[PDB]
Amino acid sequence: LKPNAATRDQLNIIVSYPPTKQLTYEEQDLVWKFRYYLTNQEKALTKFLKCVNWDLPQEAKQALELLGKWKPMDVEDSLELLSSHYTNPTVRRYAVARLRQADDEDLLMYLLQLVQALKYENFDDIKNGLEAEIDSSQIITSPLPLEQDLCTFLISRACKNSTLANYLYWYVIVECEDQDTQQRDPKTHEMYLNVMRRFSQALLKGDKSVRVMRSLLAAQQTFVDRLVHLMKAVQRESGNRKKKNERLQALLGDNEKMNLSDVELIPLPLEPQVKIRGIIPETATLFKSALMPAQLFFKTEDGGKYPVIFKHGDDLRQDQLILQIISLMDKLLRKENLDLKLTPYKVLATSTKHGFMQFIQSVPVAEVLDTEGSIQNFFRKYAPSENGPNGISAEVMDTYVKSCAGYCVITYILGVGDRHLDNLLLTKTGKLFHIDFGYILGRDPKPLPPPMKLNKEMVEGMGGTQSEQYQEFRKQCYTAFLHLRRYSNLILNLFSLMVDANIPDIALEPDKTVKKVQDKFRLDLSDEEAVHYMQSLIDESVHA
Ligand SMILES: CC(C)OCCN1c2nc(N3CCOCC3)cc(=O)n2CC[C@H]1C(F)(F)F
């Protein structure tokens, strides 16, 4: 009923393990033995529930009396309980009970994963909450004249928060529209339709503002359906990029026919806090790309311009997951008082065949080099300073060093491949950032890719390997690395809820996907060994 000094050390080794590590039979027996002692350690509860054989009624019974007797679990840890591993209704209800403790800010960071976790819920209980044959896109547009589960909870919070409602809407829409899920997992497709029917029904039962949320959601779906129709017409248009652009601007201009240039204020699906009046027809063009994505400028509520990239005939879900992870990693780093001037641009899939991206005015590194000669020359042109380092503004140099460090570590951890200089972007304020995440988690079009994403010209832009800026780069690389290792339990749990998400590079090897991320962290190394390891990576990458 109480362990010795040696046993308490062995127990501490187990509790510290990543959520992925498989507890050995011997480790399991040790956790089951001192299960009453561990009740004071909130971080041990996850290790305890991984010992239980839920198929054995007596093991399940003992395990649940201890769950109510334990020190309440953290919010980051409750994400482990909502995975495919747990079927026990009492455990899954407990996870929702501890998630309820998070604020909406935190809930939005985890919501993409929470929609995926509905795949592990009781489908009948979802169906009973209601009071091909059904078109998912037409639910919201066709209105008719330990107690909460994941579906009830998410809907409860969505009805109180408009930002949360928008993302719950579009995330569930993409899930219903998934053809793979329709063919291979019909009962799952039926569940998602039921989450949408229950969402519509709850909004229709709400107050003045809650009923208007459903109108707004319908107006958004209708707008997106019209934009898709225009995209198909432009993509079909016979001729060159100019023929297609003229057709694009003409259809956008004809507001009576298409209703895209003049609309009553609606939330931009990509970022719902930004209300829009419509698309500016005149500045709308197609990108050179053979995929024919369009650049569209939205007229905002308060007289601004919000440039967007709308893609048609492409699945944006891989880029969506990566940009919400980059957004989360930036949020944890800022929490830890480290602002690395990162660019977590918004991405929102509106279906498996189309979606939005937030356009950030920038110049590819390739173009910078092939027009100005060097990054330092570019910076000297647009941001000069007499007193500044190398005749470049000090702020621009600090932004460039900080962003280079941030993306270097982030793209290392996420195993981002296909890293040429056309998909590495630079801003006149010094912001370096990555785009086009078609290859992640070790994948690359060419064989044996390098683990770190550095090059000659990048270090040149800092003022070479002998500069003070290059020293600060190193300091910021290893500092950010340690910070992200502290949040490894959170990062690994969110990646664990994505194993069945139909993300191409995840779908490849679902079983091996989370260990691929876990390895990058080098949790086997102490914080001091990690600092050296990160510098070895940098030095080996800069020299090669
Ligand atoms: C430099 C820029 C004009 O290059 C456009 C390149 N462009 C693109 N821009 C992204 N940005 C989002 C973040 O702000 C910048 C643009 C993200 C992204 O996925 N892509 C994929 C390749 C092409 C296109 F046209 F096919 F979509």
Does the 362-544 domain belong in CATH 3.20.20.80? Answer: no
A 10 A CB-CB count for 68 gives 9
| Bridge partner list, 470 | none
Fold classification of 208-361 (topology level): 3.30.1010
Cα-to-centroid distance, 422 and ligand 1 (Å): 9
Distance, CA of 386 to CA of 393 (rounded, Å): 8
Cα-to-centroid distance, 319 and ligand 1 (Å): 11
Helices 208-236/162-177 angle, 10° precision: 50
CATH of domain 3-207: 1.25.40.70
Chain position carrying tokens 């010992």: 51
In Å, the largest CA–CA distance within the chain is: 80
Find out whether 347 and 357 touch, Cβ atoms under 8 Å: yes
Q: Where are the domains of the chain?
A: 3-207, 208-361, 362-544
Helices 394-413/510-520 angle, 10° precision: 140
Confirm whether 208-361 and 362-544 share one CATH topology. no
Cα-to-centroid distance, 493 and ligand 1 (Å): 30
Q: Which atom of ligand 1 approaches the CA of 362 most closely?
A: 1
For this entry, resolution in Å reads 2.7
Find out whether 266 and 216 touch, Cβ atoms under 8 Å: yes
- Which residues surround ligand 1 with Cβ inside 6 Å? 287, 289, 291, 293, 309, 319, 345, 357, 359-360, 362, 364, 425, 435-436
How many C-alpha atoms does 18 have within 13 Å on its Cβ side?
24
Q: Residue 534 to residues 171, 262, 451, 538: CA-CA distances in angstroms?
A: 36, 52, 11, 6
DSSP E strands: which ranges in 340-413? 347-349, 354-358, 363-364
Ligand 1 pocket test, pick from 308, 323, 435 with the greatest ligand atom count within 8 Å of Cβ, gives 435
Cα-to-centroid distance, 253 and ligand 1 (Å): 25
Experimental technique used to determine this entry: X-ray
Q: Which atom of ligand 1 approaches the CA of 363 most closely?
A: 1
Taking the CA atoms of 391, 393, 398 and 400 in sequence, report the sign of the dihedral they define.
negative
Q: Which atom of ligand 1 approaches the CA of 357 most closely?
A: 12
| Bridge partner list, 299 | 278, 305
Distance of CA 155 to the CA centre of its chain: 20
Find out whether 67 and 35 touch, Cβ atoms under 8 Å: no
Q: Which residues contact 242 (CB under 8 A, 6 or more apart)?
A: none
Find out whether 341 and 399 touch, Cβ atoms under 8 Å: yes
Amino acid identity of residue 446, one-letter, is: K
Cα-to-centroid distance, 435 and ligand 1 (Å): 7
Cα-to-centroid distance, 388 and ligand 1 (Å): 31
Distance, CA of 530 to CA of 500 (rounded, Å): 31
Find out whether 461 and 472 touch, Cβ atoms under 8 Å: no
